[PDB]
């Protein structure tokens, strides 16, 4: 119980804003720590849901936070014979947030977009968008790699090839250590899913206020497929990064496609040019294998290991009866150029409809025993069904089969305690990594501090 469950800090956002739907740690420039929090149904001055982002500084007491201002008005712009339009109603700004260096990236997956030319159009569709902010300088930029100006008719004659109109870019997001932003777009290419990547430096430098449609020169998008296995696979529902080919110069991507091959689900590991290295198939259909993906070295051998979440996995029980509890899979990375194999360990939920594996967070080395640890969210788990987060400690063999600590939700029913999870950062500067937990249903975020031993309370 070395994560103090009594001395909790609570931050809160507006009612109905889904404050805590996403979150991340932010180190300004570059010492003090703050929490960026997404609230994707925050109202704008107009009383329509545009979403918002909050930047909470560290305070033991917690409370309300300042809003990170973004452009919330719709844009209309005529270029040549075309009219380009953005629609921010219900766009879900703060559906995903991620901090890198002195920059915060916040995305609106359901921002709509349209282009008009004479009597024709591209169709009004959710291409999505991400907003980048440099909070100290006040600088702003945008990145919306799925916006196009091809008219409806052309896609019909193409049989809908290279159709990025429903991307929902920024559904998921991650930044590499080098500063490459990687966006998941599950609706890409007519719901196959795609990834879009660009250097944060180049997004800022190539952005021009009032353009709406532009090409970031160093950007890189994944590919369309005619392979039925990928159809409606939601490739990019979740995303992560790591080292998986033993070459520290290159960086690999981990992508979740939780409805791949007729809802079997799959996680793929690719290089930065989207050429796939390994594929992990789902165990059971409709389990949403790949809903979440985490990367960390849990067994201390210096090689990143893979954690995949299957929240809707149904477990076998007496009298041939299945029970939806959720499951998490651990894949240890072997030495040499060898590929990953079968799961080294299967962690399974206990509570019915609990959705164990819905979120997976690296905690770093929580008890400083030389092995990194993880936290797994069961947003509707625990005896009451109010939510639960389980801490699993790492070891030489992989991870422990049973949790060292179980954090029960302090919020009422429907809070979604655990839906978002982040750790591996020392927030109060006591030398020990802490954990933050979102409860978007209650519009709150809980901060759990690590105590300076393997303590209890």
């Amino acid at each position: 119980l070395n994560l103090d469950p009594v001395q909790l800090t609570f931050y809160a956002g507006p009612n109905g804003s889904q404050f805590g739907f996403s979150l991340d740690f932010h180190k300004d420039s570059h010492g003090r720590v703050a929490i960026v929090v997404g609230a994707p149904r925050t109202l704008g001055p107009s009383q329509e849901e545009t979403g918002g982002v909050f930047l909470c500084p560290w305070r033991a007491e917690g409370g309300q936070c300042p809003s990170l201002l973004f452009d919330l008005r719709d844009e209309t712009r005529n270029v040549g014979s075309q009219t380009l339009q953005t629609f921010k109603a219900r766009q879900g700004l703060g559906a995903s947030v991620v901090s890198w260096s002195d920059v915060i990236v916040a995305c609106a997956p359901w921002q709509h977009w349209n282009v008009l030319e004479k009597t024709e159009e591209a169709e009004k569709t959710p291409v999505g968008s991400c907003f980048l902010a440099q909070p100290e300088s006040g600088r702003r930029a945008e990145y919306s790699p799925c916006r196009g100006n091809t008219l409806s008719r052309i896609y019909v004659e193409n049989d809908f090839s290279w159709d990025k109109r429903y991307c929902e870019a920024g559904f998921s997001s991650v930044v590499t250590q080098a500063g490459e932003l990687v966006l998941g777009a599950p609706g890409g290419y007519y719901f196959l899913g795609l990834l879009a990547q660009a250097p944060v430096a180049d997004i800022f430098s190539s952005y021009r206020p009032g353009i709406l449609l532009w090409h970031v020169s160093s950007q890189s998008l994944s590919f369309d497929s005619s392979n039925p296995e990928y159809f409606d696979g939601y490739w990019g529902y979740s995303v992560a990064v790591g080292e998986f080919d033993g070459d520290l110069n290159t960086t690999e991507y981990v992508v979740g496609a939780p409805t791949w091959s007729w809802t079997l689900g799959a996680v793929e590991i690719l290089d930065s040019y989207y050429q796939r290295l390994h594929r992990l198939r789902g165990e059971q259909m409709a389990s949403y294998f790949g809903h979440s993906v985490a990367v960390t070295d849990v067994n201390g051998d210096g090689r990143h290991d893979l954690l995949v979440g299957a929240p809707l996995y149904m477990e076998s029980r007496a009298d041939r009866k299945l029970a939806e509890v959720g499951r998490v899979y651990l894949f240890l990375q072997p030495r040499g150029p060898h590929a990953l194999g079968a799961p080294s360990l299967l962690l399974t939920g206990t509570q019915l409809y609990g959705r164990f594996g819905s979120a997976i967070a690296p905690l770093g080395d929580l008890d400083r025993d030389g092995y990194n640890d993880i936290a797994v969210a069961a947003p509707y788990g625990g005896p009451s069904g109010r939510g639960q987060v389980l801490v699993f400690l790492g070891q030489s063999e992989g991870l422990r089969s049973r949790p060292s600590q179980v954090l029960d939700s302090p919020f009422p029913t429907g809070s979604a305690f655990g839906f978002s999870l982040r750790g591996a950062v020392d927030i109060d500067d006591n030398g020990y990594p802490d954990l933050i937990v979102g409860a978007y249903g209650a519009n709150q975020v809980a901060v759990y501090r690590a105590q300076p031993v393997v303590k209890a309370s």
């Binding site: 709509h112 809707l312 979604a416």
Partner: protein, 455 residues
């Protein structure tokens, strides 16, 4: 020699019968003074009591109405009426047979995928609809059928939201016309009016949405949990037949529409016959569907086209009790699943007593399909159509009620037939009719004379 009949020292024939069922009385005037009048029948005959003068009532159960059980008015219980003659503290036993001759009540609700991909399939599902009515009608006369339609969650990016004409006509940009998009729509409540069901099904036409996977699992959930709307009957056997030509949306897909609230498993249809939570609540998970299908005792049948038959067979394994058929122009395959389903329907013969007197008390010996007599049980289980079970009932009375003429009922649950039992209490003697009051033979006309005794 001596017994409870003689030791009581009874004054009258009536009191003699009240002592015990085994006692008899001797009215014969030629019987000497020393001999006892109230005794066993053997001992009375042994003391030269005339057979004519012996008063010894016997309990009996005469069948009044004994029509035989029906084959293939309807007789499921036999006998139907019985007259019970009981004397003080006695108990006569009788028999009753039950047979499930009548057809089982069956409810079929039909879910029609009416998205644009079903355009070329529309005839098939309309044919299948009316052929369901026919197939089930010839299996059981007690049928009630209904239907509803689904497409998908009417929200971007499933729904075309431009231009403004596309909301009222999704097929606008194809220069044709289809209906506006809807999640799930309940068209016709479960009803016996089959000819109306056939008319309505043939009127249906397709709508259009964007993505191949559809929202049929919303429809299955609502068709399961909206009892009063759909109109399932408590006693009936419930079949839910589901048609589609495409893959399906499952829980957690809804996040592409901004929907994150888990499916609460409750009914949200109501007044306008539309699933009102379609745009605000996520698709249901396989487990939640299973819970509710089991809870509401509904059998799900997948009637899907051949291109997704393996997909739904696979889902069928994750939802036990579910069967899958191939939807096409030929309706043989899916109708067999309806025949199979009926052939699994089992019923129970559970006896219940009504209007039983306070003084009467019953006990039952049951003989079910295994033909073994189990005492103290009044219910058999696992009956098919035509199967017969048997019960042995014993009616015991406590003393002698002065109400005399009563009657009670023994009725199986769910059956309309019943055994009526008329009860009579014979507490008097034959010589009590010929009573001469104020007779000068007994104390100067102060005492009555009956059965060879003064009062």
């Amino acid at each position: 020699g001596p017994n409870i009949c003689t030791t009581r020292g009874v004054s009258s024939c009536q009191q003699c019968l009240a002592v015990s069922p085994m006692c008899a009385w001797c009215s014969d005037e030629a019987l000497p003074l020393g001999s006892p009048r109230c005794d066993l029948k053997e001992n009375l005959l042994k003391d030269n009591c005339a057979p004519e003068s012996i008063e010894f009532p016997v309990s009996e159960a005469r069948v009044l109405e004994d029509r035989p059980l029906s084959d293939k008015q309807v007789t499921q219980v036999s006998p139907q009426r019985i007259a019970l003659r009981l004397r003080p503290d006695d108990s006569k036993n009788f028999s009753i047979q039950v047979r499930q001759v009548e057809d089982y009540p069956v409810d079929i609700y039909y879910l029609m995928d009416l998205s644009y991909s079903m355009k070329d399939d529309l005839w098939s599902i309309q044919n299948l609809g009316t052929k369901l009515a026919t197939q089930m009608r010839k299996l059981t006369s007690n049928l009630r059928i209904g239907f509803g339609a689904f497409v998908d969650k009417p929200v971007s990016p499933y729904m075309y939201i431009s231009p403004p004409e596309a909301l009222e006509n999704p097929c606008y940009d194809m220069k044709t016309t289809c209906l506006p998009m809807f999640g799930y729509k309940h068209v016709l409540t479960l009803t016996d009016q089959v000819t109306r069901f056939n008319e309505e099904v043939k009127k249906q036409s397709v709508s259009r949405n964007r993505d191949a996977p559809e929202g049929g699992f919303d429809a299955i959930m609502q068709a399961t949990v909206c009892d009063e709307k759909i109109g399932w009957r408590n006693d009936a056997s419930h079949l839910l037949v589901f048609t589609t030509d495409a893959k399906t949306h499952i829980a957690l897909d809804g996040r592409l529409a901004g929907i994150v609230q888990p499916n609460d498993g409750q009914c949200h249809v109501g007044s306008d016959n539309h699933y009102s939570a379609s745009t605000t609540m996520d698709y249901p998970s396989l487990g939640l569907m299973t819970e509710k299908l089991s809870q509401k005792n509904i059998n799900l049948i997948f009637a899907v086209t051949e291109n997704v038959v393996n997909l739904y067979q696979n889902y069928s394994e994750l939802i036990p009790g579910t069967t899958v058929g191939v939807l096409s122009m030929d309706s043989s395959n899916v109708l067999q699943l309806i025949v199979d389903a009926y052939g699994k329907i089992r019923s129970k013969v559970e006896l219940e007593v009504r209007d039983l007197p306070e003084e009467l008390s019953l006990s039952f010996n049951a003989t079910c399909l295994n033909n073994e007599v189990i005492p103290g049980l009044k219910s058999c289980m696992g009956l098919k159509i035509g199967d017969t079970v048997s019960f042995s009932i014993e009616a015991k009375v406590r003393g002698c009620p002065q109400e005399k003429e009563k009657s009670f009922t023994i009725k199986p649950v769910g059956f309309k037939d019943s055994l009526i039992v008329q009860v009579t209490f014979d507490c008097d003697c034959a010589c009590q009719a010929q009573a001469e009051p104020n007779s000068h033979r007994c104390n100067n006309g102060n005492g009555t004379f009956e059965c060879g005794v003064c009062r």
